Design an enzyme around this catalytic site. Sequence first.
Site, PDB file in Angstrom:
ATOM      1  N   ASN A 172      54.294  67.257  20.119  1.00 38.84           N
ATOM      2  CA  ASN A 172      54.453  65.925  19.563  1.00 38.84           C
ATOM      3  C   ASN A 172      54.380  64.906  20.690  1.00 38.84           C
ATOM      4  OD1 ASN A 172      55.458  63.929  17.371  1.00 38.84           O
ATOM      5  ND2 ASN A 172      56.820  63.628  19.128  1.00 38.84           N
ATOM      6  N   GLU A 173      53.353  64.049  20.640  1.00 38.42           N
ATOM      7  CA  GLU A 173      53.223  62.927  21.567  1.00 38.42           C
ATOM      8  C   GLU A 173      53.215  63.416  23.010  1.00 38.42           C
ATOM      9  OE1 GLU A 173      56.223  59.952  20.704  1.00 38.42           O
ATOM     10  OE2 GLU A 173      55.256  59.458  18.801  1.00 38.42           O
TER      11      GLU A 173
END
Lengths: 639, 638, 305
Positions: A377-378
Amino acid sequence: REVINFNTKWAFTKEATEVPKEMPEKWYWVTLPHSWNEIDGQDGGNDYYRGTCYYAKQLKKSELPEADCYYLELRGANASADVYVNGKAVAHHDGGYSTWRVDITKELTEEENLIVIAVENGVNDRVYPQNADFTFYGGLYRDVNIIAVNKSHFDLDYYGGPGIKVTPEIKGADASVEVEVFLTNAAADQKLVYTVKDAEGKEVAKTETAAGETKAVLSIPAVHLWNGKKDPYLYTAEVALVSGEEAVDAVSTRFGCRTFEIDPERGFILNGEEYPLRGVSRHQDRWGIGNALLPEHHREDIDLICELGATTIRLAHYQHDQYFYDLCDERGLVIWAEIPYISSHMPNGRENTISQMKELVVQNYNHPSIVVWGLSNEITMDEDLLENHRILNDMVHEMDHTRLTTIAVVSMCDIHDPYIQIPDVISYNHYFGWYGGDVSMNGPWMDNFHKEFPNIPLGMSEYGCEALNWHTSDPKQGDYTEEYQAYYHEEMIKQLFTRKYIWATHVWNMFDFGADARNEGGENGQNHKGLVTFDRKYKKDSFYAYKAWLSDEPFVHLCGKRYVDRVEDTTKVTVYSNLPEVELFVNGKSAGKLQAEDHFFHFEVPNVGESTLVAVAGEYKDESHIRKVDTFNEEYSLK
Amino acid sequence: REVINFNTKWAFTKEATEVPKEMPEKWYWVTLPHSWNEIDGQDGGNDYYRGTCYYAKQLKKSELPEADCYYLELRGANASADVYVNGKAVAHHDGGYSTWRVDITKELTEEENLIVIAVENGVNDRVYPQNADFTFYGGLYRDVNIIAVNKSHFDLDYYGGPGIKVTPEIKGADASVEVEVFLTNAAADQKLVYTVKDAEGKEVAKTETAAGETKAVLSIPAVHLWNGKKDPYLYTAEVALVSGEEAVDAVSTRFGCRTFEIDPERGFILNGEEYPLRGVSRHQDRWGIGNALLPEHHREDIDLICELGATTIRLAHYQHDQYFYDLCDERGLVIWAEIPYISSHMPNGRENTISQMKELVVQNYNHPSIVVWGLSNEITMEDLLENHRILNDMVHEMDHTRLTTIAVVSMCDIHDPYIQIPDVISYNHYFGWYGGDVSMNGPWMDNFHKEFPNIPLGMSEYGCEALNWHTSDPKQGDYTEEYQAYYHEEMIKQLFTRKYIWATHVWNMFDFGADARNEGGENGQNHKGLVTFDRKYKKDSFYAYKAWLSDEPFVHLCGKRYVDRVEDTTKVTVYSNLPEVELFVNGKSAGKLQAEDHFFHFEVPNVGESTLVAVAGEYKDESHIRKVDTFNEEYSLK
Amino acid sequence: PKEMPEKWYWVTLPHSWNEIDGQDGGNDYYRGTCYYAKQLLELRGANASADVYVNGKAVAHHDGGYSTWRVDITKELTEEENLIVIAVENGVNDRVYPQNADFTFYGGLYRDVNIIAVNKSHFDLDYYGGPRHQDRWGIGNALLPEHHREDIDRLAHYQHDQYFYDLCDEEIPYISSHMPNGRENTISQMKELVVQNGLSNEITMEDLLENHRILNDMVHETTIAVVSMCDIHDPYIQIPDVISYNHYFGWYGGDVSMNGPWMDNFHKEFPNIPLWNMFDFGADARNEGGENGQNHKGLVTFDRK
Ligand SMILES: Cc1cc2nc3c(=O)[nH]c(=O)nc-3n(C[C@H](O)[C@H](O)[C@H](O)COP(=O)(O)O)c2cc1C
Ligand SMILES: Cc1cc2nc3c(=O)[nH]c(=O)nc-3n(C[C@H](O)[C@H](O)[C@H](O)COP(=O)(O)O)c2cc1C
Ligand SMILES: Cc1cc2nc3c(=O)[nH]c(=O)nc-3n(C[C@H](O)[C@H](O)[C@H](O)COP(=O)(O)O)c2cc1C
Ligand SMILES: [Ca+2]
Ligand SMILES: [Ca+2]
Ligand SMILES: [Ca+2]
């Protein structure tokens, strides 16, 4: 095989010198689930206690059933833990979100055995997560069990897995179900009895092998397809390990039979039919108890999500509880599961990414609600990072031939970045209209990526806006009002829900959640992008925008019930409804009828004295009240 | 009981993806001892690889003598380690410096079992050291062994200890020695045969008991005391576990019989007599190989320390090898041992201080050389005070025969509460190197001894950097050999004359690895040694100490590497433990000196190329100089 | 009481209300809260717990009946006639030592009560009252100077009175049964004992260890008396600087002879650790010997005759 609950009354402390040799007498009593950050990690300052804490409890043989082996099972120990039995270390685990187990038979040498579990959630460069927008609640926040089994038994030692792996193949109207099993200390003379049961417990297939053959294929004629919310049909698979004529160990799991595709233009397809994925994300915590969640808390979260009508949940940013995944399978929700490989690539975190992902897949392969495994994530908030993704992606494809990989990409990351080409599907986390920009940018931003990469299935894995108990008649980005968040989600709904190529959308977030480093909006320690507040007691107005578009439960909802005192002589009054026409009544007289195709009924209403507002659609009603004032109620204003 | 060497040809990688299912084929081959930081941790920039690394080796049951149990023993895995046998985790350990063991019998199910050891030396808030002036060299940098024993055997599972605890008490000409032993899976019908043996291996005491009576008090008639360098006499206790008429397991340890005090006015006392502790510190590393030290390296370090004549070594900053402590026993050196509780108190670090101190004491209790346990070093550079009260009580609880101590950073206020906790304290002062002036040291010590007349006070560090730079005008910060020698001449005159300073420790005996250091013109090293990092060059300051501490007669010409000199008349220092030195320049006497403090300061004509000969009795040294118009900038760092 | 009492019983300190019913048997001496009232602050001996009230307001509370404690009163003295009231209590609780021991817990203001007039800037008064049994037949612990001198002509199980140590010039009541909630009182009474001038007696008749370790570390920055039957390898023996045992061989059964031998065996075991009563004294639970109410293991009688 017996499962003994082992949650009751541990001695807990934060300031213990060494592993205790006698049962402590002045420690604090907790009954698991427990997190010691339930208060200090939900209130701001980024100062929740991070460190090593001890849990101590006595295991008495006089209470255990007679059995060949005893296993300590930990459903969740955040983040790292060590297990001692009568002072000797027997187990160490890194990973706050998965099940792990240890055979402690050999160390139960006394009638009263001191069981000590040290749990740590400190800072280090090795165990994910370290950098993220949520509290790393320390503790034994999920159940601890004891598992008593025969000397030959289904595997309890392989990465916390159930010991059974079900893989259905759909062939026309029937299903072929491969059931694989894993044995510890099994004898060549034992048998394996495989059964598949119906939703009513009725046997529908049965086969046997010798213990040396740990696979079998069973047929299910005229299969009931797991088909989402329409018919979340679940079978059960059972395998018993049999010595002579007797079952000495047995494992089971439910499963569902379905196919799906993630088509880059038609979006999500389920069992051959288009099945739009329109939903939310959910963290596994709650106001007051940290992440020490009970079964009823999991049931409430999913009840609220079902009431909103979401067809998908993104279970960010880590492995959730088995009971929540079961609930998804039972309710027909389509799930994205991921590991906490988040924000910032740690070069020394690579082993732990591998470990957590192995546990993620092994422990959750059987859940039919899961269709994608999320790698990170990110993560770009570089070559080592790319290799970490190749390895995770090939390992997942190696372990699971029936699901797809995905990532969640940070807003600013260039769309030509190489790591976007690695997984099978991607989604972006965008906040145009909240972190600067404007809510109208989302739709076209997605259209432009779609134009650039027409064959990469593209979803929206985060989008959202903060809102607390603040109010205005001039909603604007950054006033933190209920009304601006309502407008934002109306506009996201209009843009996102009409683009079929967006394969999945996930509101960040279904609930307000704990983030001890957040100090904004008037209430610190929380991300307030929820559709529902942290304690689950208040559904914000934006919740009903989504219910109006996704639920078939007829309703009519008056917005702005908490914005009572208004300066303006004529005030906007929004109603959301999945019915075709709403009529608004002001102190008993109609202010007209509206027919909103996008379900957003914007009325303009005289505001004189005190007024009662009633909205009427068919046989459904809602009520609110406003009153006229000469100056703005400064209690509605964050400033 | 057989100990098998398991150092041979491990597969090794720095890429820690996953534990390999099969023996690898393109990793790098190493034979332990081994550190992967042997080059990148000794060269500057604070950039040496920290992270998780894998070692993989096959254990083949056929190559193992038959036995009921097999333990893997690791003498040193820096810093944190996990062991896997056929993919199954069997042990975890935090602590780069102590022995830990694990029973692995149950996992030896194949004929070729795959052993994988994951070793990690990264950044965290939990495992010491994290903040210190030395390289945390990752790896299996000490022996790994397989230990094959009988079902009933002396304890291998208790904090890596030997299984045998030996406490001498003395009264009068005789000694009484308590021998305690600890057993795993013993049976009631078994016996313990205890024996004490001479330095010549002759039995001096013997007694039998039942396996249930695990303590014995043997008596040594007319005991030879362990008396430091004067007579480092060692006995040997052995205890055998007997089934019927058969010894099925035996353990043993050498030990020494000695008493000692740390008198606040008289200093250190050993067997009733004053025994002044003047010495050095020693780090367990070496140029080129990191801390992957061989026995010959331990032997050479201690030879060099003995040649200098130290009576004490501070073995900073962590537990050292058993073999080095044995040498210390054999040579009569008096040891300060400590854990890496260092620079900065970590709140999440308490547990690891406890575990490392337990291991330190349990594994080294029998070493007669060791007199003090160090709790921490510069730890202030309330949770801290509790942490020290826990360590102090635990050591005092475990070892009724040794005192506790600390090493205090220079600026720490002398009234600070934590100084009151240990039995004795020492300071690390660098007046004359890190600012200040060398004359400040003695008076500073005087103030403390005035302010606290009954806390024994030592100097746990003091020193001065020196590389191959030279000057006729020594000043702090020129990094010259000449300034360091002057600094140490002045420190000896101040320190060695104050009886009440119970122990002095030069920082350091050797240059050592510190990868964050980037100074003096050779990065990656602390150059405060008396001897260089490869042990090849004795700096002149080594001889200033030898002249005070050694009884071997010698004369040493200083400045041999300072040949080109501009001045017509140049300073030439001779160190000698002989009373009188005559110095000759091209065969012509340049003067005859007597120096009580052993520091012979001559001045000499510098004309042409000259040969110098220093003479004391039958002892001589030789050097050469040369007159030059301009300074040789190769002698100059800047 | 709001006004100076009229019908109460007049006493002049030193005073204990157990002077009689605590020296005569049956373990029935009055234990409870009693009140002293005076019109007009330092207390040398208030057994065991006390509260001072000045014109009706609490100003200080103290647990520990064997040590000095003061309270600045300057600001409560608000009239010319000030009613000072001191409630003293010697009851049963799990918190204030002693609770279990072979002597009467004589209640009252059994040592002097002074007033100290001080310059504002002064040698401090408020840090823990900082700068043989103590009883007699007929007067409990309400001893006068003359009774010290006659006795002088081991100070268990509590701090004795300052003047008596002076007659020595020229341990706390942590006794018998270890009280978990008693930890604070051993600490406060130890801080007091050492400031204005023995850790335990027979306390074994890990929380206990922790209590000793806390005490030993605080005083050092020490001794115990050990009950006869205790186990010489008990962990807590290795906590204080030295130790001493109490043995009654030849009295509580057995033979006089076992004593010499016994202490030998200890000395062999632990070569590094160095290894009652003068007068009869008041012990109201004692109902043995024909004269109930006294421990008669004394060389001299209770009345010192
Ligand atoms: C979903 C799943 C579950 C598995 N469960 C087990 C198990 O319970 N016991 C076992 O011995 N192997 C199990 N395996 C087999 C392992 O994948 C196998 O040991 C593999 O060769 C090891 O590679 P890995 O470290 O990537 O898992 C499972 C595999 C999958 C895909
Ligand atoms: C120098 C030393 C060595 C010891 N070696 C052992 C040992 O080998 N095995 C053992 O069980 N206990 C050993 N002990 C300690 C005692 O036996 C100890 O009280 C007990 O076994 C465990 O106590 P703990 O809770 O501190 O671990 C040793 C103690 C000391 C001081
Ligand atoms: C024997 C002794 C007497 C003391 N007397 C006083 C005193 O009368 N007034 C004062 O302010 N501090 C006094 N102290 C203060 C000490 O500083 C104290 O023990 C410690 O530093 C902190 O006190 P605390 O218990 O309030 O934390 C005394 C200390 C000792 C050892
Ligand atoms: Ca907080
Ligand atoms: Ca370097
Ligand atoms: Ca009575």
